[PDB]
Amino acid sequence: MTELSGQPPKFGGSTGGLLSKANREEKYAITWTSASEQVFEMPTGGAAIMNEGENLLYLARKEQCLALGTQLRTKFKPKIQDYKIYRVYPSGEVQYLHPADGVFPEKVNEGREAQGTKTRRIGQNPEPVTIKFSGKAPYEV
Amino acid sequence: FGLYIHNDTMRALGRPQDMFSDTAIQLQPIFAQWVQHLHTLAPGATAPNALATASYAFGGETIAVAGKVAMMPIT
Amino acid sequence: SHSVKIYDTCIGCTQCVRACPLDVLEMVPWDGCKAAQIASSPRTEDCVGCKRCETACPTDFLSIRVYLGAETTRSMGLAY
Amino acid sequence: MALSDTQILAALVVALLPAFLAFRLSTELYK
Amino acid sequence: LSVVIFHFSWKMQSDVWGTVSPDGSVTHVTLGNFAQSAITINGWLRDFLWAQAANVINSYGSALSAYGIMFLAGH
Amino acid sequence: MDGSYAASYLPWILIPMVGWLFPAVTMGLLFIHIESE
Amino acid sequence: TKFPKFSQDLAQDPTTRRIWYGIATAHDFETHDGMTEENLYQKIFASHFGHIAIIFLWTSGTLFHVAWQGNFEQWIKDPLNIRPIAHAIWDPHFGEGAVNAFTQAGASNPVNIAYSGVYHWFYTIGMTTNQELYSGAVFLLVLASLFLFAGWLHLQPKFRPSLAWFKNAESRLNHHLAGLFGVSSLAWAGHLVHVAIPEARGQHVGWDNFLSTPPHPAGLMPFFTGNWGVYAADPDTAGHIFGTSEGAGTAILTFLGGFHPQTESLWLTDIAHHHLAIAVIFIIAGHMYRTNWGIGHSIKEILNAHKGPLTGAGHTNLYDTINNSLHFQLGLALASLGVITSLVAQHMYSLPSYAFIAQDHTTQAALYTHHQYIAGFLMVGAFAHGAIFFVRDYDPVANKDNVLARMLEHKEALISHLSWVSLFLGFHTLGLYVHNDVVVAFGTPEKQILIEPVFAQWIQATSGKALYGFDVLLSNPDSIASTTGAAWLPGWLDAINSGTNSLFLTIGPGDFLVHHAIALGLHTTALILIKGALDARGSKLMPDKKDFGYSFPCDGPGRGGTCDISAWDAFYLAMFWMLNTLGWLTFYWHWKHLGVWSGNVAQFNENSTYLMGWFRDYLWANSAQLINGYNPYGVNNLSVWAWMFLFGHLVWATGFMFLISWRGYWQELIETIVWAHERTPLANLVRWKDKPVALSIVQARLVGLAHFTVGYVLTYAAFLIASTAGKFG
Amino acid sequence: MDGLKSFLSTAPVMIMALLTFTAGILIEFNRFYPDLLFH
Amino acid sequence: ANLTPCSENPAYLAKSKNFLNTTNDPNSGKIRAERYASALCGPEGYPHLIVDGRFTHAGDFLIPSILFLYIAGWIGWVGRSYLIEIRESKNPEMQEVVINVPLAIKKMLGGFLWPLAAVGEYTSGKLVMKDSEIPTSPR
Ligand code: CLA
Ligand code: CLA
Ligand code: CLA
Ligand code: CLA
Ligand code: CLA
Ligand code: CLA
Ligand code: CLA
Ligand SMILES: CC1=C(/C=C/C(C)=C/C=C/C(C)=C/C=C/C=C(C)/C=C/C=C(C)/C=C/C2=C(C)CCCC2(C)C)C(C)(C)CCC1
Ligand SMILES: CC1=C(/C=C/C(C)=C/C=C/C(C)=C\C=C\C=C(C)\C=C\C=C(C)\C=C\C2=C(C)CCCC2(C)C)C(C)(C)CCC1
Ligand SMILES: CC1=C(C/C=C(\C)CCC[C@H](C)CCC[C@H](C)CCCC(C)C)C(=O)c2ccccc2C1=O
């Protein structure tokens, strides 16, 4: 939630990793609980040795973290489905991003809310003449 | 390419003494010219059982067969 | 950020949620289809606009739309 | 029969005020 | 590869090929154009792509007539 | 290169002005403007 | 971030694309945050005055440079052999050959020979000395300052025009037909008869002279009473010399018909009488629409009354569609301007109305090609603003069952028939060209298909050309339309039968095939543009294109993958077609007139029927003097056009990079360049404020389109100018 | 050969046989009667 | 017309003495030189084609024109009615990928009744579909 507990995996070091945006604007951090000491391909580049137990990996974009989560959930026979993706600011605060409700978004649970859901078809969208100078969008209003 | 644009512009501006020609500022390819000198000096010094060179494009006489030129040295 | 609007033609097939590689879509409960669920996009500030959810959808003129609006560091996908 | 230098300088001076007036138009078109 | 074969064709028909004369003098096909006129883009256009394409252009009613309607075909 | 017309001294200073002095201060003012907040 | 001020969504992204998108949406005032309906019109009005002052500064600059650095006083002494001068050359990069070759037309300074028609214009207007057109340059500077002050004062809240003033269509159509098109043509006919015709008669009329002498010795009273034949009492005979008093009978409005035999131009009295006869009809037609006075017409009752059985609801509820929107008005304005600009081009080479402009062949060629390349632009922009109107400003609930909605209801019939017409012309024009080119390649040019263009030759037959022998309606002298006793019979007949001028040129068998080629380019460009405008709202792929806007990159790789799905991308392809067909007609025009001016008409009549004749006798033969603008030996005055030739080739191929390669490659490359700048030691001091990204998809499409366009235009303005200035200069 | 009759009746082989027959009768008509610009 | 016929044109009579032999027949240029004599030529010596519609020059244009208007209509009818008779057998997709070559040969032979069949299909209403039952695009 606010503190990241984990060890860095065995990796020699790469060039496509954390650039100067990490210590300035934001970075991301994936934490998961392994079973054995297997090998995984990080989206930064090359392969790395996944450490045994709870390990922590710092990445630069959220898409790399979700691509690693896809690689952890599909490309292993002990399917690692207990990973947590946090967003780390340079101020020190840590925001729990995924799977923050607690259950995966692919299945439904009670406690979520329908954000960004329309009550019409796309053919029932309004025309851009009646809202020509309101400043809004033809899909929003 | 900017060498080609530069002497294109120096020829278009009527100043041929500022181009990259041979009479102008000359960029002599000294390394391949030295390699051609070694290939011309090869038979007798570094290839003693060879009569002629590896080719007549490095350096040597002009080979003429039927009124045409087979291979002359390419400076 | 872009605007991911999800219309009422969604049949709850949850293909768009498992296709999006950024965790913006998620299935919320509903009562308008056989599957009794509809996709929803709360985390629209993380959507890059890749329209990978508008490749796996079975309805005619797919029930989820991604309107490419403003851009930021997340929506442009920059690691620098 | 050709022009004089004072006619060229008078042309520059009489075209100086369109520069000020276009600067005024550009300023009020920005705001 | 288009620039490589252009450099090959022009250098070999300006500095290598041509007829030979019995006194030893060599006259080339394009009379030595590569020395001072291969350094310009206009020199590559005028002295190579305009001057040597005339044999493709003016060859109608002859044996080299299919090459004209392959020239325009490739364009 | 000279000028047979009247005021030949004037392009001698107007060509470097519109070539260098006008675009350098225009790009300087525009880069100060479009990158400020 | 302050830039851009108008857009809030572009003032917040840290990327470098907000500078480009702030540049290219600076004039789209509809997508500005915080702009109401009337502020749109008021900002348009002030920007209109800014443009109308820029065009006066440009005309004043042309006038000032002909006054200052031009040999205008030495050009009127012998305008058949000496060359006009645009301006002088002051770049410091000139060597000695580029100064010894650019001191042309008798001037010690390096000059630049003018190829626009400003000298023949200013001589036909009546300007003789440099002082009066310098005074015209100062007058245009003051007039440009006047319109700049109008643009400033029409932004104050006191003098701010209301929205109902801009919606007042009938109270400005009257003034644009009478007080802008009529009384200004009336003032131009007045300037013609007062200054232009007496300077063609030798009498120097100035501002201190026109109040004293009358243009006609009979006075103003024969116009007030009647019997106007004394205004055409004695015209200028065939033995008249321009600018002098030699055989020049004074009569101000003489309708002759045909050409002046000395200047190969129209009679200036005929020009003045024509402008009077158009000013009268324009002031008459300006009193049509209803204003504060109850007499006139209101356009709502005219449009609502034009119904029909096959038409549908007619033009009902259509005045509000044009008057509320602005892209509909801009599309109609650009369409009418494009057709009349090509009308300018087609009537400034066959009916020249300037002194000795039919002999300066490079000037006529440059002016014709310039106006055709403007007309193609304006036609493409008319259809582009039609697509913008269909995206933004079209509502189907108000335009119900009228001609616009019924146009949209059968768009799959329209663009499929345009697809048929395009394939019909294209398959067989290319089929006949390849058939001709093969049979000439096989040494048998008698097997060519040379279809005689009998329809156009029939039009020349009913125009006056008795060459083809078709005795129909004007070439037959006993016809009904020939024996009417009108004024334009003998002069126009001898002008159209003279085989020296460029009026109604002898149409041979090649012009059949090339005019089918221009019909091909016109139909295909109309196909892409109408398909863009009618599918601007939607189609079977995405029927929410009204919701996405006009220009947007794609809709992802799904549903097949909709690259180039917007109506902006139909403009994109149609821009290449407009450049292509304009290149076709201008290659055709320039080769025809190179056969006419040199007297070797048989070269164009024999070689144009197959494609290698175009590739040999036009592109290969006429460009021999262009590429020899700088040899290793010497440099002549055509060196700047050889450099512009290669420059145009370079920009035309630079657009290929943005066209062929797409964004994702360049983004992956820019990631590596960003890494190299962030890990270079001594360049870690200098860091960007805005994050550098690649150019966007629609953006770099537009950049590659711009390079294709200006590369095309620069290499053709190099070749078209230098080839006919090397042949005739 | 219950599959050879289907393979010889696919679209490319049938359009190539039809274009071979069309080019054959066109070349034969152009050999026995050459150079016909009109009728 | 202003064009001289090939029977008396001086440039054509100068060019006909050395017409090239196209086929293997060594007298092909001479028989072409007397075949093209009926046509009319301009000032270059090449046979032009009058296309105005006058029947005295219909052999230039109209006689091959309707000849093509048969054969194209033949191909069009053979391509149309065949699709109709594979609108259902069991599956039209494979019958469009591989050809039912006896059915195709039957249509290819029977296609020479195409214009009377075209007026018959236009009168029976089975040629032009209705404007409402056609799958149009949304406006
Ligand atoms: C020389 C290049 C070239 C050619 C031939 C074409 C040809 C065509 N374009 Mg086109 N186009 C081009 C460049 C070209 N384009 C470029 C650079 C652009 C800018 C991106 C466009 C953009 C463009 C648009 C946007 C559209 C077209 C369309 C068309 C078609 C209708 C126009 C026409 O004239 O009818 C027909 C003319 C022809 C010349 C067709 C004959 C082609 C060959 C000779 C047929 C012979 C068969 C061939 C030999 C079989 C090959 C066998 C081989 C496998 C061994 C036509 C096929 C339109 C279209 O398809 O819809 C109708 C359309 O909407 N074009
Ligand atoms: C728009 C018309 C126009 C154009 C294209 C040119 C072009 C040129 N002028 Mg020029 N000029 C113009 C109007 C124009 N002038 C007017 C109206 C005047 C009267 C004041 C002058 C007075 C003038 C002098 C005195 C000289 C030139 C010179 C030159 C040449 C070098 C550039 C330079 O130093 O200019 C600099 C020009 C100025 C400082 C004053 C003119 C500025 C005008 C009024 C602004 C034009 C507004 C323009 C449309 C804005 C474009 C906006 C667009 C980018 C969006 C160049 C050919 C020089 C020359 O001949 O060198 C060989 C030179 O010595 N001009
Ligand atoms: C459009 C305007 C323009 C103008 C007027 C010039 C002018 C010049 N260029 Mg140039 N150039 C231009 C555009 C222009 N260029 C562009 C767009 C490019 C890119 C393709 C180039 C690329 C280029 C190259 C690659 C070279 C030149 C060179 C030259 C110079 C040739 C003589 C020389 O060595 O000068 C000597 C140098 C100078 C006169 C520099 C100016 C220093 C002045 C005198 C000091 C004044 C400063 C003063 C203290 C401040 C006064 C304050 C003010 C308010 C009064 C000449 C001054 C050549 C050169 O050697 O220039 C360095 C050269 O090699 N140019
Ligand atoms: C290294 C090569 C080089 C360079 C630097 C130049 C430079 C120049 N030449 Mg030149 N020239 C060259 C080679 C070169 N030439 C060659 C090889 C030839 C053939 C022999 C010529 C032939 C030639 C002629 C015949 C003439 C020149 C002239 C000029 C001057 C242009 C006057 C000016 O500043 O207008 C200002 C420049 C422009 C308006 C062009 C820029 C257009 C921009 C890119 C588009 C607009 C961008 C944006 C919308 C607005 C700007 C943004 C900015 C304000 C922030 C300039 C000094 C002219 C001259 O002496 O001046 C009167 C002239 O008449 N040249
Ligand atoms: C007598 C009164 C009068 C006059 C003279 C004008 C004049 C004008 N109005 Mg205007 N207006 C008027 C009354 C008048 N208005 C009234 C009463 C209203 C009440 C609602 C308006 C409302 C109005 C609006 C809302 C707008 C204008 C605009 C304009 C300007 C656009 C015309 C232009 O620049 O091209 C003038 C073009 C020509 C004169 C000729 C047209 C082209 C011809 C047909 C081509 C063929 C011949 C050609 C000239 C040959 C060229 C040869 C070459 C050598 C030169 C123009 C200055 C617009 C503006 O602000 O633009 C600055 C605009 O948006 N007006
Ligand atoms: C009467 C003329 C006229 C007017 C008033 C407009 C007005 C408008 N058009 Mg438009 N248009 C026109 C003609 C016109 N157009 C024509 C003739 C075409 C066809 C070519 C178009 C094609 C067109 C498109 C495709 C679009 C518009 C759009 C627009 C709107 C916003 C424009 C904007 O922000 O541009 C901002 C200005 C720019 C981007 C500048 C680009 C132009 C540069 C100068 C070209 C570069 C040339 C280069 C520098 C030359 C180099 C020379 C040398 C140095 C080598 C605006 C209402 C847009 C719209 O409504 O939707 C958003 C839109 O998408 N127009
Ligand atoms: C034989 C079937 C057939 C028929 C009856 C038609 C009929 C038609 N097509 Mg067409 N078309 C066909 C096949 C066919 N097409 C195929 C296979 C293609 C892909 C190359 C096209 C591509 C096409 C385009 C792009 C366009 C048409 C258009 C049209 C209409 C105008 C006439 C025309 O230009 O056709 C001329 C036909 C062509 C240019 C292409 C067809 C050429 C092939 C060789 C014909 C034979 C096809 C097939 C092999 C024969 C089947 C025989 C069967 C026993 C297996 C007309 C209704 C136009 C339209 O919309 O009109 C409003 C139009 O723009 N067609
Ligand atoms: C899309 C769109 C659009 C656009 C369109 C356009 C762009 C169009 C154009 C069009 C055009 C461009 C047209 C034109 C045409 C014209 C014509 C067609 C004319 C004709 C005329 C006549 C016919 C006359 C007659 C005559 C003759 C011919 C000769 C002799 C004389 C006389 C006079 C008798 C708009 C804007 C609407 C908007 C909406 C959408
Ligand atoms: C004679 C002649 C001529 C004339 C012509 C004309 C003028 C034309 C017109 C045309 C037209 C005016 C047309 C119309 C049409 C329409 C329509 C409507 C059509 C129809 C069609 C269809 C319907 C189709 C069908 C089909 C067939 C038939 C077969 C195959 C299949 C199909 C299906 C394709 C000329 C001068 C050139 C020359 C001389 C001769
Ligand atoms: C090269 C290239 C790039 C890379 C483009 C980059 C990195 C832009 C770099 C531009 C440099 C800085 C030159 C810009 C200066 C020009 C002279 C324009 C002047 C600036 C104007 C504002 C006047 C793309 O991003 C791209 C995207 C989609 C399709 C094709 C392409 C493509 O071809």
PDB file of C-alpha atoms in Angstrom, chain A residues 90 117 125:
ATOM      1  CA  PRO A  90       9.656  10.958  -6.167  1.00  0.00           C
ATOM      2  CA  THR A 117     -21.293   4.077 -19.301  1.00  0.00           C
ATOM      3  CA  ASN A 125     -25.543  10.015 -30.569  1.00  0.00           C
TER       4      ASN A 125
END
